[PDB]
């Protein structure tokens, strides 16, 4: 269905090689497999960088890019075809599949890599790889180099330089292509439908996990292999726990529900947070806190455009929230003073957003040249201001305590401004209450 | 939601300590956490042995059992309360919760383990732990021992014996208590409802993942934190792959669907397989294979009772399937000869079941004294015969190729034979077709269920 | 049938905490269970105070209210779910039921209360509870406090103040909400029908228990789990015994029958007394005493309104009954003098009413600031004057001896007066005789 | 009414004293009174042992038997006559009643017991009483002994032996006299009529308590002061709850109704269970389970006779029910192995009966000399097999789930067999359906 096309992976290989120095080689392993318990495996997730360059879904693989190589620049080591093992575990691409389906120029059994990779590294000046990212692989690499070190007298010369690959490759990933935006847009649409379903099913007497079930249900019907991250479904006081994950508490009349969840499609994330009343009607205190957050959400979009700096959106949300907290009497004093003294962090103690991509907290440098990154079209990020009044915050009136609200949207920088991908699930008080009322009467 | 009660964890601790030799100590770590991608963690799953003795859900904890320690036989190292960390990741039990909620005699911050545990090990004759299970922990233990070794000046004596804990503990786990059976019944019931919904929703044009959605939906509505294992949803020829997990193929009219899936509840597994026609009606070839597997399934139960040995169920399914394959003309010859030469393995190449429990493939010794284990009440296992005609099997008529069937139930040995936990989801041809037809009809009428 | 809704119990919880001093805690146990004989239990009745705040019907439970508590102000300790026991004894709510169905913020097994409750008491300034109501609980509480002081060196501080919860909570119960009046209306209606049936079935030759049978039958068909109190069915001279309960005498021609009986619904009482002739016809002497009691009954309602004080209705019934007794010749002299010397107590020796609510003789202070409480809307009470002439009272003519009469209604105070809940069973001589006559064929 | 005659109580006292060793004394207190809520008391129920020996209905009494005492062997402490209290409370027998209608040789006000009883105990070798049965009485006895011991210097000799009265007295109660059988027979007849009325009135749309209303109605019309136990009226899946007492569910078409209920008369129990279809027609599955329980019920009687031991009836019901479950396919295997390994307990998890008498689970030793008690004429017991299929029992076909059936009768061992007292309410499918059909039409 919606996916990155085979040719785009080739294009990305080309773009990385075009930034490598001549006579160099880049090497990337696939992600490891993990055992969840005894012999039951965790769901497999390909490494984002390796996936970005190959689209190859299997474990036990290593790729090499060798610019200018006569027989072909892209080499893949992967599992061999094995009829007995594939009877149990599923089909393998094999070396023919790697060349044919996945576009490799040459492909070799993963079991033979020790007998082959050293020869390909021999004679190159630089090796590009993710130093420190996978220490097990880093040791494997040093062994291959030591093999070259033995023949030095045969005139085998090992490379003299190791260069950090993530610096270059993550900067590529920071600029989303049209097809990437397309996949993220689709993921966002699936996630928006999921959040709506959670709003429509919610009633007092259910548990937090009932709403998580609705989310996973819609995620998977959309084709998601897994969420972009563990879903947060936090009722009542639990909404003040930023990464609450118990998802096991009974839902009570009068609770707010905070839901931070998003699917992933073809290894591209979506990330949405909505907050809504469990009983379908915001109390006056809930409504006031919610609409303040919504004001900060809406203000942040005005500071996301080409030429704006990364932090401008966050700073806008700080201004809005601090001013609102003063208006409500939850903070006393001068807004500029309170910001300088960071008094708002009693209520809003996290950043307004992060890069979004193949990892939900995506790669890419937030600072360049001792300055905040300048935004350019194709960059994608979240906007997620929040307010959390702890249940034990004695400095505020009792009716405010235990209220947590976050409103998060996914956005892409465009030439003239930005594009919001998550408008498909509403966020005004009116639309939310309308949506929940309609579902309530349909069910009855 | 059903769960093991606090008192049962204490009884298990006592039973284990009653088997340990005097002046010994047992040590178990919690399961590690794994990064899934970048800074996104995998869903956390407590180590089954650690969970079995503590019920403690947090990572970075270590438990110790010290029989006869006057100060308290059960010691738990765990995270301490940290307000900034909890604002983000959630509340922690802390040392006070460990003693109070989880019944520990003493509790210490996990950060202090290096300064406390060597002293508890010192003077003990034996340390019981899971040799080789957690290499990182094995390294920690050797450090603690080296620490004791270096206090000979003060007269410290390291233990000289290290005993594999799994021998005693996994035999305890093999005998399910009444409370354990109650949790497993509930898990099986939840899984049964999930399999039914998959059947009711299936139609050509959907994808395999649409059915997996229904499974996860029902699992989680029943309280499951996760499946017992990654769900297998295999349409058509994919059913001939025993652990198919791509789950991404479009369903075609005429396909069979094989679903192997089960939730887990409070870390106790359920494991069900059902096969059904994607269009609601078994073809004649599909029905012929299906009824033969069903015959094997039913026959296996007759050999599960106190006094029977473990392999008897599997042999019965081998006789039934081999005899039936000859009957249908898929094999040729004498049934007894075909079994002796394993000719059936071209169609039925796996075992008829496994222990069932906190791990799907549960712990417990299948052979004692070189012979197959004798069954006793409380032992739990699966029954899962199957037949798989590979798509490229040229030794049989083309109409049979690409057909795969497995029918799996969960059972517990009782004083009177066994108890099947998974009858909640039907397995005869009539019931399956009736179930699917009813749902199609109700859906056409826009009735809600 | 009708019942207090879940939200009202929460409203009452909130109202009580609004009056507790800050950093305090209130604790309430459920009622105990009693063995009737060998291993047969008595019917279970929840403690009215505990029920009033929780609606929770189970024994072996304790509630706690902790104002301002960050993780929830309402904690309930109750029984754990148990498959083997529930197979015999019936379903239990458990901790999940306590949170979901009954609205607890937190819930713990009753078996762990010793490990949890002391920690919740620790650091509180003040503990509200019903001193002396449950001595076993009082003892239990002292143990919990001892756990706190044993940790005194660590900075664990026991509370320094214990406050009688009855003062606050029973004053709450004294003012009936709209939902409470609705329940009490229904219970009164059921009891009215029961009284009618007893009148319609009565005839000489039956026994008192035959009439008690009709009462219990109608009570239970209306949903009552138990009467509000042991029914009194007193024939003839038994009507001169105020708390007659033998209910085993044969009804004789010429007997009066006095019936004091009412059901309770969702732990709310009704309380009705009617007197009537066994043979359907008041004798001249019976009628004379009866209509005098009825005059007192009717007069009392005129002194039940906001602004009046509690004892005014009683005083009115005293004036009416003494005056009538003189007029009929059973007393002799000046009415005001007779009242000063309580000469009427030879015939009318109890008070004209009591508060009415979750207990038949309901809670609530009759005197405030050394004087009779001023009535306010929402208060509920009974009106039950009577006259009882002992069979052996030689100071009056023989024709009066052995006559006992009481006429009791239930009343709620309103904005401008009162509402009588029990008009559904008649009390005039004419209506009563007509009722019994009409039933004859049937 | 039917009741134990005053001569029989005297006989019982003589029989007990004839089993006491010389120069001893036996002491039994009345049952305590309980408060139900606030000042409302629970219905009073005399202690069965005290009742059995005295017939005396009041609380606040203590009896003493002093064999061979010249001034009178039977002494009763009880409330003294008090006119003011009687005016409110009810009439008291007083000391006049005690020596009068109740036949005491001597009688004293209970207020003076501390000044008289020790003198009666002093000089006796043994004291017979019910160790541990009434802890309040126990400490009172220890005080009375201590006051004697304080006089040891001045010649007083306190008894040195204290003997469990239960063992002698409960063995007497196990053999029912002719009059006791007459009383139980009547109680069973009353309960029979009550069960019939429940069947006749039942219809979908009623609630369980409407049927309990019919039971209490008929009980009380027969003279019962209380049921022998709280009535169980269990509709639908509630029938699998062996002592279900919520009695508050709506009755649905297709439900079975299980009613376990019985009145007591003069403190003698009856105990009947019948199961019947709410709609008057047993479904095929309901019928098959019902008929199997009925076969077990009828079979039990063949093993109740003198010389049979107590458990033979129960063993018969186990045998019959297991075979029938095999025949129906709810169990699979060899019947004898299924019996030996108790496979039936998944469906039939209680005993087939109990002694029956003044307490519904009556006193008496089930085992003598490490063996089951041999039956003798005069012993009384119940027969109550049942089968219960939980709604979620997936080891059986769906059509059986949620069916609960129990069929209970009361029985007296006779010289050649047993006598069933509860035949007055039918139990065959035909008679039940006919009974319900006739009532619906009329
Ligand atoms: O969950 C949150 O609120 C913050 C947003 C930035 C990353 N984590
Ligand atoms: O190992 C076994 O017994 C089964 C066969 C298929 C999946 N697991
Ligand atoms: O308390 C009262 O007022 C009434 C008088 C008769 C019985 N109770
Ligand atoms: O528990 C008891 O004593 C009886 C036996 C059957 C059901 N009720
Ligand atoms: Ca237990
Ligand atoms: Ca309600
Ligand atoms: Ca607090
Ligand atoms: Ca006689
Ligand atoms: Ca055995
Ligand atoms: Mn988020
Ligand atoms: Mn996030
Ligand atoms: Mn985010
Ligand atoms: Mn399986
Ligand atoms: Mn399996
Ligand atoms: Mn499996
Ligand atoms: Mn009254
Ligand atoms: Mn009254
Ligand atoms: Mn009264
Ligand atoms: Mn019985
Ligand atoms: Mn019974
Ligand atoms: Mn009974
Ligand atoms: Na527990
Ligand atoms: Na279908
Ligand atoms: Na006349
Ligand atoms: Na006994």
Residue numbers in the entry:
A (entry chain D): 1 to 444
B (entry chain B): 1 to 449
C (entry chain C), D (entry chain A): 1 to 442
What did the original publication write about this model?
PepP encodes an enzyme belonging to the aminopeptidases P (APPro) family (E.C.3.4.11.9), a type of metalloprotease that catalyzes the removal of the N-terminal residue from a polypeptide that has proline as the second residue. It is one of the critical virulence-associated genes identified using a P. aeruginosa-C. elegans infection mode. In contrast to other metalloaminopeptidases, APPro is a cytoplasmic aminopeptidase and recognizes a restricted scissile Xaa-Pro bond of those polypeptide or protein substrates that may be linked to virulence-associated phenotypes or other biological processes beyond the general protein degradation ability. In this study, we solved the X-ray crystal structure of Pa-PepP with a resolution of 1.8 Å.
The monomer structure displays a two-domain organization where the N-domain (1–175) is composed of a mainly parallel beta-sheet core (B1–B6) flanked by seven alpha helices (A–G). The monomers were arranged as a dimer with an extended loop contributing to the active site of the adjacent subunit and an average interface area of approximately 2050.9 A2 per subunit. To identify the binding state of Mn2+ ions in active site, 10 mM MnCl2 was added during the crystallization experiment, along with 10 mM proline. In the final structure, there are three Mn atoms in each monomer. MnA is liganded by the side chains of His354, Asp271, Glu384, Glu408, and MnB interacts with Asp260, Asp271, Glu408. The smaller anomalous signals and 0.5 occupancies of the MnB site confirmed one of the structural features in metal-dependent aminopeptidase: the metal binding site B has relatively weaker binding affinity comparing to the site A. Additionally, the third Mn atom (MnC) is located in a position previously identified as being occupied by water in Zn-load Ec-PepP structures. In Pa-PepP, MnC interacts through one solvent molecular (W) with MnA and MnB, with a metal-separation distance of 3.1–3.7 Å. The modeled tripeptide-bound Pa-PepP structure indicated that Arg153 and Arg351 accommodate the carboxylate group of the P2’ Leu, and guide the C-terminus of the substrate toward the tetramer surface.
